[PDB]
Design a protein around this ligand. Structure first.
Ligand SMILES: *[C@@H]1O[C@H](CO)[C@@H](O[C@@H]2O[C@H](CO)[C@@H](O[C@@H]3O[C@H](CO[C@H]4O[C@H](CO)[C@@H](O)[C@H](O[C@H]5O[C@H](CO)[C@@H](O)[C@H](O)[C@@H]5O[C@H]5O[C@H](CO)[C@@H](O)[C@H](O)[C@@H]5O)[C@@H]4O)[C@@H](O)[C@H](O[C@H]4O[C@H](CO)[C@@H](O)[C@H](O)[C@@H]4O[C@H]4O[C@H](CO)[C@@H](O)[C@H](O)[C@@H]4O)[C@@H]3O)[C@H](O)[C@H]2NC(C)=O)[C@H](O)[C@H]1NC(C)=O
Ligand SMILES: Cc1nnn(Cc2cc(C(F)(F)F)ccc2/C=C/C(=O)N(C)CCOc2ccccc2)n1
Ligand SMILES: [Ca+2]
Ligand SMILES: [Ca+2]
Ligand SMILES: [Cl-]
Ligand SMILES: [K+]
Ligand code: NA
Ligand SMILES: [Zn+2]
Length: 805
């Protein structure tokens, strides 16, 4: 209930929104159906349009008018944005040459440069080049400011998850807005774009930028706009707020455009009808910049032009129907479209089995355009599992496609030609970033980066301390002229032991065997030196990783590789080795096929054993340092040490062996040497963080050997590939993966074929940032380089996406 017969006089777009049944005059009153009776008359004036004309110059102020052309308007802050151009012979901002903004040039009384976030829904990254002729204002922001070729959205590439990630720096699984539509089973309530439940604050986790600002004494304009408030009115409202007295004036604002998304759905990302919405957005940016220029704020404000996601071609005919795969289709609820989320229609259904639903949806049609997953098996780079609002069963849908439950759903609701929501690596889902102003760099292009990083930078721009978030603070320092954040490397928590030879062969009763009783002082001092770490600078090129949690571990040196061996998990946390361009792949000799050798530096009690693997009919083993890449027949023996062994399903060993035998050498050949660090990951609770030992749900039968959920590798070389990996003078290049350690290859529909036809594609699907591996292991990599730490943080957030240009 609203007493809508209070008034909006003097209250239009009030920043402190008032409590029911007192009526409202804020940005969102329309959305709540709670505006005072006179809101439209007083706050949504339209009389005479949005532009000054020659006859209106120096007019008498008429309060009915949408904006003003009178002499007093500038003091008041409510001139039409083109007032100085029409009435004072000024030029439009877009027609002025750009000039470096070295320092904020702000009116007296401004304590910090304001920040204006200009957010555009569905603005696909390629619009910057493809629409450049019709977007002169945006092109000036882009060419004169700092820009990335594209910005990576989060998954799912929907509006609400992405705007709220922008606001918070958090993955959807952490902020809780995991879709445009959601069921929370704790609340037993549903969240939808249309309706009232989305207004409840219990949906919205983390701490968005406007709250961060308020908590720290920085006033914020309201970020949200009701759809019926015209764009010119949103711009004029921001320009009036900027004219408030110092004590009332916000320092941070957002504008939101529903375009070009709205038209993109109807006409496709590049429909001829798309030109007009792009023109209209540009004119809005123009009105803002002209308006700032009139207020002498155009070299004072930092402006961010940013999108939430792109737009792909998707039509009705490109729909897969679950009714074509499932006989029980009415016993499930599907969240449909450009992703699928499945749960049971009724929690009282005891015969609902997710395992049989997944099997019925797996590799059933030759060109099947979606892939089912238990959410914990989704690529770790999506960070899309650790929320009760995300259903256990997920469908990753191919770009250009929809999934629906039954044909009736699609023709009882062709309407649309564009949609979005797909995997956030997909080129069509990429969006835009431009920063322009005194705090951003001048005429600078930066590499693509993820939208989770922006909250930290917006905090830097405003002098705020960010709430804990998923950005890596410092990794975007290269966007900024000043206000950079200078972090220190985290402190190592556990120091390693460096064990020497302390055990006799016969102390080990591991059920292991090796044919190694082979027979010199020239070569014996040599092997001892290698065991003392003489080759370690070749194989540990960027220093040893730091262990950031409490544990007991040993550094083990060898001719070809160095490892940090966990006495708790009975295997390496990490294994590091360098493979030059010239290196040769050899085979495992016949005599060594089932060889596993005791490591006389490590107690039998801290070792794996072969009997456990023999007993465990499901589990086999592999090696972290590949025997195939040994430098010599003699060095090869080190690769068979029980301390280089890890538990591996036979199905996974196909993957691992092809990676180690074929791909490592291929990358060394393509990149001029590679350094590789590989290791296990344990993430049984799918939270993206390193498990403690008491979280482990599976061990090798009858043993204390924990089974990894994933295996990682980080493959580093010189960015200038004319220099070998081990003699690199400048910036580095990295690609990494987090491969799921699965007992079958059901994920890969073509896995009955030769590994050359499917393994590399699997690895590409599971591409990862070094930072993702750090969260999952509690390690910190690249500790000893000569590069600036900010540059290393950028390297650690890099994701190799394997999309064309
Ligand atoms: C991305 O960045 C974010 C931000 O840094 C990282 O998320 C953090 O991860 C931390 C580790 O998991 C986590 O710390 C926990 O906090 C608990 C207190 O939580 C409340 O307070 C904070 C601060 O105000 C608040 O932000 C939280 O908000 C969450 O929960 C509400 C629901 O009420 C949501 O609205 C909101 O969206 C958000 O949800 C997300 O986080 C939770 C986990 O907290 C998930 O379950 C959700 O799915 C969703 O992802 C909270 O309101 C605190 O109680 C925890 O302490 C327990 O665990 C520690 C381990 O050290 C143990 O020592 C303690 O004793 C304690 O254990 C006891 O409780 C157990 C569970 O009930 C029980 O089993 C035991 O027996 C014990 O009695 C813990 O410290 C932090 O909250 C979140 N923050 C956010 C914002 O999500 C994230 O990890 C990063 N991601 C990656 C990949 O790096
Ligand atoms: C989602 C989400 N999360 N945060 N925002 C605000 C926002 C943020 C940011 C950013 F980039 F700076 F972060 C930029 C713009 C916005 C504004 C969004 C907006 O005006 N709309 C989506 C229309 C009205 O929508 C609603 C939504 C809920 C309730 C009532 C109305 N939107
Ligand atoms: Ca959107
Ligand atoms: Ca975990
Ligand atoms: Cl959704
Ligand atoms: K076995
Ligand atoms: Na398969
Ligand atoms: Zn959309």
């Amino acid at each position: 209930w609203t007493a809508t017969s209070g008034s909006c006089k003097g209250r239009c777009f009030e920043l402190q929104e008032v409590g029911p049944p007192d009526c409202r005059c804020d940005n969102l009153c329309k959305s709540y159906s709670s505006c005072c009776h006179d809101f439209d008359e007083l706050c949504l004036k339209t009389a005479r349009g949005w532009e000054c004309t020659k006859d209106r110059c120096g007019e008498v102020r008429n309060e009915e008018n949408a904006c003003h052309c009178s002499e007093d308007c500038l003091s008041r802050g409510d001139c039409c944005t083109n007032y100085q151009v029409v009435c004072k012979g000024e030029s439009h901002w877009v027609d002025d040459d750009c000039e470096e903004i070295k320092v904020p040039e702000c009116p007296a009384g401004f304590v910090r440069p304001p920040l204006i976030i200009f957010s555009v829904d569905g603005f696909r990254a390629s619009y910057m080049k493809k629409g450049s002729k019709v977007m002169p204002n945006i092109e000036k922001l882009r060419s004169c400011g700092t820009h990335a070729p594209y910005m990576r959205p989060v998954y799912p590439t929907k509006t609400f998850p992405n705007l709220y990630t922008l606001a918070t720096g958090l993955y959807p699984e952490s902020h809780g807005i995991v879709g445009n539509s959601m069921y929370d089973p704790v609340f037993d309530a549903s969240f939808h774009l249309r309706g009232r439940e989305k207004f409840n604050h219990r949906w919205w986790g983390g701490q968005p930028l406007w709250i961060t600002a308020t908590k720290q004494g920085v006033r914020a304009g309201t970020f949200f706009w009701s759809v019926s408030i015209p764009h010119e009115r949103r711009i004029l409202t921001i320009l009036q707020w900027l004219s408030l007295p110092d004590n009332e004036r916000p320092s941070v604002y957002a504008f939101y455009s529903e375009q070009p998304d709205f038209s993109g759905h109807k006409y496709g990302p590049f429909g001829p009808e798309m030109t007009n919405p792009l023109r209209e957005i540009d004119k809005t940016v123009g009105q803002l910049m002209d308006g700032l220029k009139q207020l002498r704020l155009h070299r004072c404000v930092n402006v961010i032009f940013v999108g939430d996601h792109g737009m792909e071609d998707v039509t009705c005919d490109r729909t897969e129907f679950l009714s074509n795969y499932l006989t029980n289709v009415d016993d499930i609820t599907l969240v449909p479209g450009t992703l699928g989320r499945i749960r049971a229609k009724s929690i009282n259904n005891s015969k609902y089995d997710p395992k049989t639903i997944i099997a019925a949806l797996t590799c059933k049609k030759p060109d099947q355009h979606f892939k089912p997953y238990m959410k914990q098996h989704l690529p770790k780079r999506l960070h899309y599992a650790n929320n009760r609002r995300i259903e256990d069963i997920h469908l990753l849908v191919d770009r250009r496609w929809h999934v629906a439950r039954k044909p009736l759903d699609v023709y009882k609701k062709c309407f649309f030609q564009g949609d979005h929501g797909f995997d956030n690596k997909v080129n069509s889902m990429q969006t835009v970033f431009v920063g322009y102003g005194p705090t951003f760099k001048y005429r600078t292009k930066v590499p693509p980066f993820e939208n989770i990083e922006l909250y930290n930078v917006m905090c830097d721009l405003l002098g705020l301390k960010p709430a804990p978030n998923n950005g890596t603070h410092g990794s975007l320092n290269h966007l900024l002229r000043t206000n950079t954040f200078r972090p220190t490397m985290p402190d190592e928590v556990s120091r390693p032991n460096y064990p020497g030879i302390m055990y006799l062969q016969s102390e080990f009763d591991l059920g292991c065997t090796c044919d190694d009783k082979v027979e010199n002082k020239l070569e014996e001092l040599n092997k001892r030196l290698h065991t003392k770490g003489s080759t370690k600078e070749r194989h540990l090129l960027y220093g040893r990783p730091a262990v950031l949690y409490r544990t007991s571990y040993d550094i083990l040196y060898h001719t070809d590789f160095e490892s940090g061996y966990s006495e708790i998990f009975l295997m390496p946390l990490w294994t590091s080795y360098t493979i030059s361009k010239q290196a040769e792949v050899s085979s495992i000799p016949e005599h060594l096929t089932n060889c596993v050798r005791p490591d006389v530096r490590v107690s039998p009690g801290f070792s794996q054993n072969c009997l456990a693997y023999k007993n465990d009919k499901q589990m086999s083993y592999g090696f972290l340092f590949p025997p195939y890449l040994s430098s010599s027949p003699e060095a090869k023996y080190d690769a068979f040490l029980v301390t280089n062994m890890v538990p591996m399903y036979p199905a996974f060993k196909r993957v691992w062996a092809y990676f180690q035998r074929v791909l490592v050498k291929k990358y060394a050949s393509e990149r001029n040497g590679v350094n590789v660090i590989s290791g296990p990951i344990f993430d049984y609770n799918y939270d993206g963080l390193r498990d403690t030992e008491d979280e482990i749900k599976q061990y090798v039968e009858g043993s204390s050997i924990p089974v990894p959920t994933h295996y990682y590798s980080i493959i580093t070389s010189c960015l200038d590939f004319t220099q070998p990996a081990d003699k690199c003078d400048g910036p580095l290049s990295v690609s990494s993966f987090i491969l799921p350690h699965r007992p079958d290859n059901d994920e890969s529909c073509n896995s009955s074929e030769d590994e050359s036809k499917w393994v590399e594609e699997l690895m590409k699907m599971h591409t990862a940032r070094v930072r993702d591996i750090e969260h999952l292991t509690g390690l910190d990599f690249y500790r000893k380089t000569s590069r600036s730490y900010s540059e290393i943080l950028t390297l650690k957030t890099y994701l190799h996406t394997y999309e064309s240009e």
